[PDB]
Amino acid sequence: MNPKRIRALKSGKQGDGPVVYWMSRDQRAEDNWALLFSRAIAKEANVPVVVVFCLTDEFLEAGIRQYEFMLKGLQELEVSLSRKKIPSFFLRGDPGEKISRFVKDYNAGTLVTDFSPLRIKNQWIEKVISGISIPFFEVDAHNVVPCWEASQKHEYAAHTFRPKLYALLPEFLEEFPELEPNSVETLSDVLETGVKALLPERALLKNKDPLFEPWHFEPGEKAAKKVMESFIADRLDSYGALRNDPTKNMLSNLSPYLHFGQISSQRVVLEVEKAESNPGSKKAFLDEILIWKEISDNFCYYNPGYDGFESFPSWAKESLNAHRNDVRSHIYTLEEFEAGKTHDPLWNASQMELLSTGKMHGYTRMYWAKKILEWSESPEKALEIAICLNDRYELDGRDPNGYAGIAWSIGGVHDRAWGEREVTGKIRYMSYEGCKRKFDVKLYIEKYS
Numbered sequence: 001m002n003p004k005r006i007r008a009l010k011s012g013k014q015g016d017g018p019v020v021y022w023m024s025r026d027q028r029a030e031d032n033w034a035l036l037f038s039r040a041i042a043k044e045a046n047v048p049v050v051v052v053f054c055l056t057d058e059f060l061e062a063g064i065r066q067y068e069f070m071l072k073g074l075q076e077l078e079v080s081l082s083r084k085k086i087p088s089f090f091l092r093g094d095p096g097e098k099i100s101r102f103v104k105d106y107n108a109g110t111l112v113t114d115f116s117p118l119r120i121k122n123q124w125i126e127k128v129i130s131g132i133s134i135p136f137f138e139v140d141a142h143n144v145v146p147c148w149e150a151s152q153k154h155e156y157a158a159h160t161f162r163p164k165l166y167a168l169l170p171e172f173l174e175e176f177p178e179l180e181p182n183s184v185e186t187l188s189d190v191l192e193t194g195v196k197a198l199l200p201e202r203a204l205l206k207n208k209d210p211l212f213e214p215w216h217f218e219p220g221e222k223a224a225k226k227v228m229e230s231f232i233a234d235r236l237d238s239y240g241a242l243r244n245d246p247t248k249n250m251l252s253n254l255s256p257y258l259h260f261g262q263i264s265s266q267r268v269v270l271e272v273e274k275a276e277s278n279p280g281s282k283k284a285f286l287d288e289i290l291i292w293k294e295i296s297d298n299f300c301y302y303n304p305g306y307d308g309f310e311s312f313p314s315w316a317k318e319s320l321n322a323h324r325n326d327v328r329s330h331i332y333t334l335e336e337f338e339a340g341k342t343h344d345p346l347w348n349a350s351q352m353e354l355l356s357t358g359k360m361h362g363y364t365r366m367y368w369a370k371k372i373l374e375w376s377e378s379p380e381k382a383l384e385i386a387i388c389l390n391d392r393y394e395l396d397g398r399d400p401n402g403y404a405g406i407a408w409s410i411g412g413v414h415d416r417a418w419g420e421r422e423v424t425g426k427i428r429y430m431s432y433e434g435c436k437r438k439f440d441v442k443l444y445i446e447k448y449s
């Protein structure tokens with residue numbers, strides 16, 4: 001219990017009814033600080049707690065691979081919350097209008113949401129505060145250290161965020177207390193109608209066969225815990241020296257569960273720190289789930305233009321601009337990149353892996369984004385192409401981790417200058433020849449036709 005995890009958004013008259021919790025980024029019952037604080041505030045106010053989720057109108061911007069994954073977990077979440085006397089209300093529409101009408105017609109006392117630094121989340125918040133008179137608070141239930149408490153500014157490098165975050169670990173890395181219980185439309189409805197609207201835009205093969213394969217990642221809080229415990233007892237020892245070999249999938253595979261909030265990163269760290277494994281293989285894992293993951297929330301929180309050329313460091317903007325008029329080797333289009341029609345079979349295999357599984361390997365995701373810059377008309381055209389492709393097919397898309405990693409590959413955010421070659425400038429270059437020495441490229445290409 002720490003009061004630094006909750007920040008007030010608007011102060012008003014405390015109502016006389018139930019505490020409404022606005023679930024957005026953390027779709028789980030266990031290990032949800034925003035859910036725990038909702039009950040704690042409800043208990044001291046002699047009022048029940050209720051959880052609300054808003055299905056936004058932006059779902060038609062992505063495929064069904066993300067729609068079915070999150071909705072299937074919501075079906076498990078509704079039953080898991082019913083076992084704790086907490087009613088889950090699933091609304092469909094704009095949050096600025098659905099939540100404003102829900103608070104008034106339900107007599108809410110205190111309305112709480114979870115933290116998300118993305119622009120669209122701030123878009124809803126601005127409209128919510130314009131239609132409520134009750135207190136409005138938000139809780140960071142996605143980061144071990146609150147994003148505003150870790151650093152009060154945009155950190156420039158990973159080696160500068162590591163001392164600040166690791167110093168605040170003993171105050172914020174704590175066990176999760178139990179969520180004690182209190183004292184309309186079925187989800188199968190919207191899942192059927194939603195899929196029907198996304199079917200014409202589903203990615204297919206030549207024989208009218210859908211490209212997505214949904215047997216790689218089962219959604220749900222239950223399946224998320226099995227993936228964590230399996231990775232620790234079978235892959236944690238080999239994560240250090242095999243995280244960059246996509247031929248062996250020696251990764252946690254938590255990104256679909258982590259992005260949708262189906263599992264807490266603080267719970268994952270607790271189980272890893274209390275697991276006797278290789279010393280080097282462990283330190284490399286927390287470096288990604290603590291430093292690199294929570295620096296992405298830091299990137300989107302303190303940079304309003306996180307998806308634009310303006311958020312690049314000064315040295316990268318000067319480097320890339322001096323190479324805007326350099327002759328590009330090739331200029332593929334959005335339709336070419338989407339179906340993997342480039343002359344680089346390592347890039348095609350990376351794009352084919354994303355279409356068929358919905359989760360590209362960590363190493364190949366850097367090579368995939370940097371070649372987009374090398375084959376684009378302008379750096380700004382690469383940002384849009386990389387964002388549209390990542391957010392449409394990645395199960396972990398539409399996440400601060402994506403915009404930060406896209407800014408890392410194209411603009412060198414949280415990176416330094418390198419050799420100065422044409423087009424890419426001083427940005428870190430990843431050659432096909434350098435990839436042949438790191439791992440078996442012939443194995444990765446043959447794994448995806």
Ligand SMILES: Cc1cc2nc3c(=O)[nH]c(=O)nc-3n(C[C@H](O)[C@H](O)[C@H](O)COP(=O)(O)OP(=O)(O)OC[C@H]3O[C@@H](n4cnc5c(N)ncnc54)[C@H](O)[C@@H]3O)c2cc1C
Pocket residue numbers: 243251252253254255258259288289290292293296360361362365366369390394396397398399401402403405406408409
């Ligand atoms: C251009 C680009 C786009 C990306 N798009 C996304 C995205 O939209 N959403 C997303 O969650 N990840 C994205 N990744 C970040 C990273 O690739 C993924 O976190 C990782 O691939 C997820 O698969 P994993 O859980 O099996 O990896 P693991 O090796 O198991 O990492 C464990 C966790 O640490 C975090 N993590 C790992 N690597 C990074 C990293 N480089 N930066 C920040 N956090 C990290 C992830 O949360 C990850 O779940 C992107 C990376 C790049 C370079």
